[PDB]
Motif scaffolding. Structure first.
Motif, short mmCIF file in Angstrom:
data_model
loop_
_atom_site.label_atom_id
_atom_site.label_comp_id
_atom_site.label_asym_id
_atom_site.label_seq_id
_atom_site.Cartn_x
_atom_site.Cartn_y
_atom_site.Cartn_z
N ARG A 193 0.69 -1.22 -0.11
CA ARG A 193 0.02 -0.07 0.17
C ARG A 193 0.84 1.25 -0.09
NH1 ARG A 193 -3.79 -1.22 4.98
NH2 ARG A 193 -4.54 0.88 4.42
N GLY A 249 -13.29 8.65 -0.39
CA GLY A 249 -13.60 7.24 0.13
C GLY A 249 -13.85 6.18 -1.16
N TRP A 304 -3.41 -0.96 9.01
CA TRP A 304 -4.70 -0.05 9.50
C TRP A 304 -5.52 -0.46 8.51
CZ3 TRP A 304 -5.16 3.48 13.00
CH2 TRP A 304 -4.16 3.80 13.79
N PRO A 351 -8.80 1.40 7.05
CA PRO A 351 -9.46 2.49 6.90
C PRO A 351 -10.76 2.64 6.84
CG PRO A 351 -7.84 2.28 5.17
CD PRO A 351 -7.93 1.09 5.70
N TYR A 372 -12.89 4.13 5.07
CA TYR A 372 -13.58 4.21 3.87
C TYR A 372 -13.72 2.67 3.36
CZ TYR A 372 -8.87 3.01 1.79
OH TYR A 372 -7.35 2.66 1.42
N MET A 373 -13.12 1.78 4.00
CA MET A 373 -13.26 0.41 3.61
C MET A 373 -14.70 -0.31 4.21
SD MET A 373 -9.80 -1.93 3.64
CE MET A 373 -8.52 -1.14 2.96
#
Ligand SMILES: [Cl-]
Lengths: 224, 234
Positions: free
Chosen positions: A172, A212, B82, B84, B86-87
């Motif tokens: 990531r 998002g 982590w 997040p 948004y997931m």
């Protein structure tokens, strides 16, 4: 032995979805007659998989099979790119697939994008398979920020393969990309000899961490 | 069994705002000889999410490097990641995966949830989804086998639920085999829709892992929930 062909009457749906009529062709060309099973399925964004035509067995006792089958894509399904797949498995285990893509709510010949940030991820040299003894496949990644303001993005890649494997391809990364700038890299995966034979889906994901929203790009490589 | 893999997570339940999970990874060589292998930690989640455990500050340039363990010895490592906000909320699977030099694959999985209760059925706002491998048949012979699944949707809402349901088997060689056609059901308040549907794995289907994937959609709200179950064809 078997030739499978797939045609879709139309390839571009609006966001509310719509109807796609598929023309299926399965040809037994070889000298011997053949038994097989076939079906029609669809893969889409957000892990969507759905059937369009149930499993049917055929014994070409060879002929040519022609079938029309339609399906509805409902509004609730995510906008994005879908792959329709006519799949045939012969009695001897041989697999034949004919795929076609359609899009819903996005343009057919545009890069995937997150509100102005375009995502251009490609199998660099179009290498669709590697030998069982191993091979290496590089991918290009270009995230172009066409917005007026900065894009705050996260990016990673895995290889989803046989035996439930999910192999890391790119850890990531997080980038704050200025307006007009591009994040570019080339990232390869070495398929070690020890990895199992079969289909790997190189799965790249890009997220705008502010909105998002997440966009995925899937690319296939087969290890023989 | 040349290798024994073990995984533990420091927590298995996150709120919708996400959080940080620490993992303990154990890989033991049970063989009498030195074993060489590669290993990694990966996460699978709702909405087609797959991500590697590792995060980097800059550009990832690393290779997947081999390690080795001599007779009897063990590798213990910790990895954190982590999750997040948004997931998507739902169930996630963390998988420690080891591929030995000889091609043998070893996996240790653990689950965590985000924004939903740990010991509760998957649900669409009061409509619970209970889908199970009926007889706990985790694999079938290479010569073929049949596996039935129970499907029970309990409408715990005050009004009727309008749903769409289907199943496929996502298998080796890019196969996506229909298991249950798309159906639409109207389920009264307090009622449960129940059925059984099985898949025949024909002798001709390729050996390997099949994910039986059941999807349920509330066609009014547009919300969709998945349930995945594994069957291996030897
Ligand atoms: Cl936390």
């Amino acid at each position: 032995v078997i030739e499978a062909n797939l045609s879709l009457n139309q390839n571009q749906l609006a966001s509310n979805g719509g109807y796609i009529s598929s023309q299926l062709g399965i040809r037994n060309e070889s000298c011997e007659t053949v038994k097989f099973k076939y079906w029609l399925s669809i893969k889409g964004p957000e892990g969507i998989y759905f059937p369009a035509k149930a499993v049917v067995g055929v014994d070409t006792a060879g002929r040519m099979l022609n079938v029309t089958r339609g399906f509805w894509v409902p509004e609730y399904m995510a906008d994005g790119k879908y792959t329709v797949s006519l799949q045939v498995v012969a009695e001897n285990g041989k697999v034949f697939k004919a795929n076609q893509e359609f899009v819903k709510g996005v343009d057919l010949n545009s890069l995937p994008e997150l509100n102005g940030l375009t995502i251009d991820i490609k199998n660099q040299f179009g290498i669709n398979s590697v030998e069982s003894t191993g091979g290496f496949v590089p991918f290009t990644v270009d995230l172009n920020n066409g917005r007026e303001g900065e894009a705050n993005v996260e990016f990673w890649m895995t290889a989803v393969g046989p035996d439930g494997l999910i192999i890391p391809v790119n850890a990531r990364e997080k980038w704050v990309i200025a307006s007009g700038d591009t994040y570019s890299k080339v990232r390869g995966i070495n398929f070690d000899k020890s990895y199992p034979a079969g289909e790997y889906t190189i799965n790249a994901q890009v997220v705008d961490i502010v909105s998002g929203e997440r966009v995925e790009q899937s690319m296939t490589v087969v290890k023989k």
